Amino acid sequence: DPFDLKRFVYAQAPVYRSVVEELRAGRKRGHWMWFVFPQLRGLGSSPLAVRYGISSLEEAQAYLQHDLLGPRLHECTGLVNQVQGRSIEEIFGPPDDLKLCSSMTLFARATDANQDFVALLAKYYGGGEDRRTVALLAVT
Known about the structure:
Layout: H1 6-12, H2 16-24, H3 33-36, H4 47-51, H5 57-65, H6 69-82, H7 88-91, H8 96-110, H9 115-124, H10 131-138
Protein backbone atom coordinates (compact mmCIF):
# COMPACT_ATOMS: atom_id res chain seq x y z
CA ASP A 1 0.00 0.00 0.00
CA PRO A 2 2.63 2.57 -1.12
CA PHE A 3 0.05 5.39 -1.35
CA ASP A 4 -1.55 4.69 2.07
CA LEU A 5 -4.93 4.11 0.39
CA LYS A 6 -5.95 2.36 3.59
CA ARG A 7 -6.53 5.84 5.06
CA PHE A 8 -9.56 6.14 2.76
CA VAL A 9 -10.85 2.65 3.54
CA TYR A 10 -10.79 3.30 7.29
CA ALA A 11 -12.25 6.83 7.03
CA GLN A 12 -15.08 5.46 4.92
CA ALA A 13 -15.89 2.50 7.17
CA PRO A 14 -17.95 4.21 9.91
CA VAL A 15 -19.95 6.31 7.46
CA TYR A 16 -20.17 4.58 4.08
CA ARG A 17 -23.70 3.25 4.44
CA SER A 18 -24.90 6.75 5.38
CA VAL A 19 -23.03 8.14 2.35
CA VAL A 20 -24.85 5.71 0.05
CA GLU A 21 -28.21 6.49 1.66
CA GLU A 22 -27.65 10.26 1.39
CA LEU A 23 -26.63 10.04 -2.26
CA ARG A 24 -29.51 7.61 -3.04
CA ALA A 25 -31.85 10.24 -1.53
CA GLY A 26 -30.19 13.10 -3.45
CA ARG A 27 -28.77 15.19 -0.61
CA LYS A 28 -25.49 15.11 1.28
CA ARG A 29 -25.85 15.55 5.05
CA GLY A 30 -22.75 14.03 6.68
CA HIS A 31 -19.14 15.11 7.17
CA TRP A 32 -17.35 12.98 4.62
CA MET A 33 -16.52 14.84 1.40
CA TRP A 34 -12.71 14.65 1.67
CA PHE A 35 -12.53 10.86 1.68
CA VAL A 36 -15.57 9.96 -0.49
CA PHE A 37 -14.89 12.30 -3.45
CA PRO A 38 -11.17 12.86 -3.09
CA GLN A 39 -9.41 15.84 -4.65
CA LEU A 40 -5.77 16.79 -5.22
CA ARG A 41 -3.73 17.72 -2.20
CA GLY A 42 -2.93 21.43 -2.27
CA LEU A 43 -6.46 22.48 -3.20
CA GLY A 44 -7.69 22.68 0.41
CA SER A 45 -5.52 23.71 3.34
CA SER A 46 -7.27 22.26 6.41
CA PRO A 47 -5.56 19.26 8.07
CA LEU A 48 -8.51 17.07 6.84
CA ALA A 49 -8.28 18.33 3.27
CA VAL A 50 -4.50 17.79 3.31
CA ARG A 51 -4.61 14.32 4.93
CA TYR A 52 -7.21 13.03 2.46
CA GLY A 53 -5.76 14.93 -0.48
CA ILE A 54 -4.56 12.84 -3.44
CA SER A 55 -0.82 13.33 -3.89
CA SER A 56 -0.55 12.82 -7.65
CA LEU A 57 -2.21 11.44 -10.76
CA GLU A 58 -0.45 8.12 -9.98
CA GLU A 59 -2.17 7.99 -6.58
CA ALA A 60 -5.53 8.70 -8.27
CA GLN A 61 -4.84 5.80 -10.62
CA ALA A 62 -3.99 3.52 -7.69
CA TYR A 63 -7.20 4.67 -5.98
CA LEU A 64 -9.24 3.61 -9.01
CA GLN A 65 -7.48 0.22 -9.16
CA HIS A 66 -8.29 -0.46 -5.50
CA ASP A 67 -11.03 -3.10 -5.51
CA LEU A 68 -12.97 -1.36 -2.72
CA LEU A 69 -12.27 2.35 -3.32
CA GLY A 70 -12.55 2.37 -7.13
CA PRO A 71 -15.92 0.61 -7.25
CA ARG A 72 -17.17 2.82 -4.40
CA LEU A 73 -16.17 5.99 -6.27
CA HIS A 74 -18.04 4.82 -9.35
CA GLU A 75 -21.01 3.90 -7.15
CA CYS A 76 -21.07 7.35 -5.57
CA THR A 77 -20.61 9.13 -8.90
CA GLY A 78 -23.41 7.03 -10.44
CA LEU A 79 -25.79 7.83 -7.57
CA VAL A 80 -25.24 11.55 -8.13
CA ASN A 81 -25.75 11.14 -11.90
CA GLN A 82 -29.10 9.42 -11.18
CA VAL A 83 -30.62 12.33 -9.21
CA GLN A 84 -33.32 14.19 -11.18
CA GLY A 85 -34.50 17.78 -11.02
CA ARG A 86 -31.82 19.09 -8.68
CA SER A 87 -28.88 21.38 -9.35
CA ILE A 88 -25.59 20.22 -7.92
CA GLU A 89 -25.75 22.92 -5.19
CA GLU A 90 -29.01 21.38 -4.01
CA ILE A 91 -27.33 17.98 -3.59
CA PHE A 92 -23.94 19.25 -2.33
CA GLY A 93 -24.10 22.58 -0.51
CA PRO A 94 -21.14 24.89 -1.15
CA PRO A 95 -18.22 24.40 -0.81
CA ASP A 96 -18.83 20.72 -1.55
CA ASP A 97 -20.01 21.53 -5.08
CA LEU A 98 -16.50 22.75 -5.87
CA LYS A 99 -14.96 19.76 -4.10
CA LEU A 100 -17.00 17.44 -6.32
CA CYS A 101 -15.96 19.29 -9.45
CA SER A 102 -12.30 18.96 -8.39
CA SER A 103 -12.75 15.25 -7.65
CA MET A 104 -14.42 14.49 -11.00
CA THR A 105 -11.81 16.57 -12.86
CA LEU A 106 -8.98 14.60 -11.22
CA PHE A 107 -10.44 11.14 -11.79
CA ALA A 108 -11.50 11.98 -15.34
CA ARG A 109 -7.84 12.77 -16.08
CA ALA A 110 -6.64 9.65 -14.27
CA THR A 111 -8.24 7.17 -16.68
CA ASP A 112 -9.80 7.15 -20.16
CA ALA A 113 -12.50 4.86 -18.72
CA ASN A 114 -14.04 7.99 -17.25
CA GLN A 115 -17.54 8.05 -18.66
CA ASP A 116 -19.27 8.49 -15.30
CA PHE A 117 -16.93 11.26 -14.09
CA VAL A 118 -17.25 13.16 -17.37
CA ALA A 119 -21.02 12.56 -17.43
CA LEU A 120 -21.30 14.19 -14.00
CA LEU A 121 -19.32 17.24 -15.21
CA ALA A 122 -21.50 17.41 -18.34
CA LYS A 123 -24.78 17.16 -16.43
CA TYR A 124 -24.02 19.41 -13.49
CA TYR A 125 -21.11 21.73 -14.41
CA GLY A 126 -21.85 22.53 -18.07
CA GLY A 127 -19.01 20.23 -19.15
CA GLY A 128 -16.56 22.44 -17.27
CA GLU A 129 -13.60 21.33 -15.18
CA ASP A 130 -11.84 22.48 -12.04
CA ARG A 131 -9.34 25.05 -13.24
CA ARG A 132 -6.89 24.56 -10.38
CA THR A 133 -6.89 20.75 -10.78
CA VAL A 134 -6.16 20.92 -14.52
CA ALA A 135 -3.27 23.30 -13.79
CA LEU A 136 -1.78 21.08 -11.06
CA LEU A 137 -2.00 18.05 -13.39
CA ALA A 138 -0.39 19.69 -16.45
CA VAL A 139 3.15 18.83 -15.40
CA THR A 140 4.06 15.41 -13.95
